[PDB]
Symmetry: C4
Subunit: 245 residues, 4 copies
């Protein structure tokens, strides 16, 4: 109904909001905790002052921002704001393959830009101390461990999306808040393991800005936040297709 | 349907509740943390004992109070309880320009009064230590940085409002809780940057009482919490008008 | 529709749940924080380890328990589970004066019993250290300050109830969660001031058990948690009657 | 409507998600707090860095995961994902006794597997330090105290389920989020007492993996997390049957 051009602008805004607010809270957490003493290496400083409370706070910053976006942009573009979701939807004939790349590009741009504008609001400390909320494996977590966390996490996100936003029997009006709260929950447990990206674009944004405004190069991890989410999403979409078949 | 006089009383009550409960939680946080040692200057004491957890708690105190007000006063006056929202609504022919000033004045009074009654409940420490939850740029944040944070923040608030309360296709009954939770999320990330006002009246109240009951004069910052929110709201309203056009 | 006898049993259960879970979380908080060092006297130990985060956690324990009860017992007795609400409803011809006392008595009993069973689960430390979550003015808060906090707090609770549960235009199904989240918000800001009772029975339960199983006598404060809530509720009910008249 | 075989797969997935995400957050909390100093023995380290905030965070990780599952798998199998609920439903002619064992077995397997996959993501520290989120009586809590906590807790969970998911008058679409938030609330207060299992399978999973990958043998406690929940659920189901009769 809405032109692909405007739906792409919407996806841009939605992913911008997602990275600005979600990743922003993570960065800010590290900034107000910087200089504190951690009990052990696993605690990189996010759960330093508020324990798991800090992780639920970050998860909620993501969740509420996501819910708000879905309610604001859902009717416009469907508010995927996540490459893995677009692909997941695509994998079960729920989204036109012809629009997959356009959306993904708008998502990637929005994420990059969202991370950039936040970096301007909070100063350079957000990048040099908060790392702009970039998702990377945590201390003691191997490459495949983070991979696994990302597929199980994105699996939950997608199967929830399938059940509450795609299935025709879903309760109207609940998709936005449920999808958001679900992400908040996944981040609460999987955050201190892989950072709980569940979104290739959510990771892309921070990575990019982190490299340009900091001598950082986290790209040797990106594959985790690309393959993991995509595999998790498609697995969920198909699984749900089978269970309701 | 309801007389402008009663809808103004409603706006008064709604903004009173907003400042009393929201700004109140911020003040209280500083009061129970006063005397503690902070890791660095950025942490002014709000995330001292609970990290980002303290910010989500403050955001939720705002959010739940806002949701409650919208459900209690929405049918009466529309529950704008925010000058920027009234103006934003106005900017897209969704509110009578003739009532803009009346509402804004009721909002400003309610906010001032709300801050005043809270100051009486918690004693003068709420003002001399908690600063009554007044929003001011945080340590290391320049004037334009706070400005930017406020427009991006209010942009999200308004576009959400446009999508869930103004658009005729919005899910009935969700506006209240969604708008509230959205504010809670914005405050979680933008709080330790500009205090996350998003509301000229929410700032006015505390500023006023802070000056009268404390040798404080934060008015050299007020422009941030006036221009920032208004610009963000109007930008959001128009953007949403374009995307759905 | 349901017999007064069964609706009284329901009120009993609902208030039992309210005090068991809500007041219980407060007690538990003090128990896991006991032995810690506080920054100042205002911080009695509740915001010691989690700052305001601890207050929102307690507020949510109350809120979620309240929402659950309203969804479980609402259709049975209306789930007042609060003398002030019953009276408030009564004050605007929304509840039979003939049933006011019966409900209030079931609420008082349920609260007393709820506090008693919790005391058995957590041991006597819940009473000697957690005080069973009894609401009393906080350090530096005078008698009238707590009084004021309780009327403003209960005012919000009731006007929300009026708007979302009594008004015929309210969105169906939202009353439970909204009422609950509203209480969670009031407790977040007003908790460290008066303990944020908003409910004569919620206070009665703990007070009683605290006296019987601890040399405590907080009854010289009870009037605050009786008059404050009742005045706040009636004021809200009438105010809402006027604004919608 | 859906084959018992697919509904069993669903129950498997739902309980997997429940244990993976819920119990996972508890384990992670202990891992980021390990090495810290506790105020007293009651605080085993979960409320160490975030106070009660840590408990609400764990409760929410459970709640959001539970809500998401109910929205994703509810239409498929009813999403019991808890032996006590299946039995409770059974006890009031709301579920076929012939399917009770099948569901319970899928739940038990899912829980065991869910705990296993999480153990792989977070490394062995999740088991040797976080105990995989296994529920056991807390310091100073006797066997019958934990038992009581579990029946009162599961009583609330079930009566809420009865009111919002079983009763034909329940508001459509609210069951998922309400059931989830209710669990989050029960865990917030009852967690530091018995760990707040409310689910024989949620306990089984961790116990099993804890024994196999750690010299742990918590099975001398399991009866608490079997009898307690079942008794609480049945008591709630019958009580609700009586009150609405
Ligand atoms: C990692 C897997 C990504 C899969 C996304 C594939 C997007 C391309 O999808 C293809 O686009 C074409 C037009 O451009 C259409 O004609 C094809 O039918 C469609 O399948
Ligand atoms: C961009 C192309 C990505 C292809 C996916 C490569 C996955 C292999 O990735 C490698 O796996 C090893 C495990 O044996 C790890 O030890 C290495 O650190 C990791 O980089
Ligand atoms: C910062 C920008 C604030 C814009 C708010 C403008 C409110 C005035 O708005 C004006 O009010 C008049 C009656 O008073 C009406 O007759 C005009 O049509 C209306 O535009
Ligand atoms: C009340 C009228 C407000 C007009 C808006 C004025 C905005 C200029 O504001 C000024 O911008 C400077 C940046 O160059 C900052 O360094 C100053 O601190 C700031 O006050
Ligand atoms: C603190 C104020 C409490 C007011 C509650 C008053 C409850 C009594 O209310 C009265 O009960 C009588 C039967 O018992 C009825 O016949 C009366 O009409 C009714 O007003
Ligand atoms: C049970 C009957 C209660 C009647 C209400 C009495 C209210 C007066 O209460 C008193 O107010 C004084 C303020 O001047 C305080 O200093 C006292 O501590 C307080 O008890
Ligand atoms: C701890 C109590 C557990 C009760 C669960 C009982 C499940 C068995 O229930 C029984 O299953 C039979 C078929 O297998 C049916 O024919 C019976 O009617 C049914 O009652
Ligand atoms: C698997 C079969 C379980 C049967 C339930 C047994 C309940 C008794 O359990 C016992 O109760 C005692 C209290 O007197 C406690 O002191 C013991 O530690 C406890 O194991």
């Amino acid at each position: 109904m809405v032109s692909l051009t405007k739906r792409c602008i919407a996806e841009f805004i939605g992913t911008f909001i997602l990275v600005f607010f979600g990743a922003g809270s993570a960065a800010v957490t590290l900034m107000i905790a910087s200089g504190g003493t951690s009990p052990n290496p696993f605690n990189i400083g996010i759960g330093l002052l508020g324990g798991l409370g800090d992780w639920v706070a970050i998860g909620l910053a993501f969740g509420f921002a996501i819910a708000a976006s879905i309610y604001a942009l859902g009717n416009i573009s469907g508010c995927h704001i996540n490459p893995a979701v677009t692909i997941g939807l695509w994998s079960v004939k729920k989204f036109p393959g012809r629009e997959v790349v356009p959306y993904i590009i708008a998502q990637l741009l929005g994420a990059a830009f969202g991370s950039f504008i936040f970096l301007q609001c909070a100063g350079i400390g957000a990048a040099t101390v908060g790392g702009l909320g970039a998702t990377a494996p945590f201390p003691g977590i191997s490459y495949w461990q983070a991979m696994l966390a990302e597929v199980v996490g994105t699996f939950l996100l997608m199967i929830t999306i399938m059940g509450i936003a795609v299935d025709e029997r879903a309760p109207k009006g609940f998709a936005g808040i449920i999808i958001g709260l679900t992400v908040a929950g996944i981040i609460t447990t999987l955050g201190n393991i892989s950072g709980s990206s569940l979104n290739p674009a959510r990771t892309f944004g921070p990575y990019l800005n982190d490299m340009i405004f900091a001598g950082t190069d986290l790209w040797n991890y990106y594959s985790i936040y690309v393959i993991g989410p995509i595999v998790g999403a498609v697995l969920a979409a198909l699984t749900y297709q089978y269970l309701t078949s």
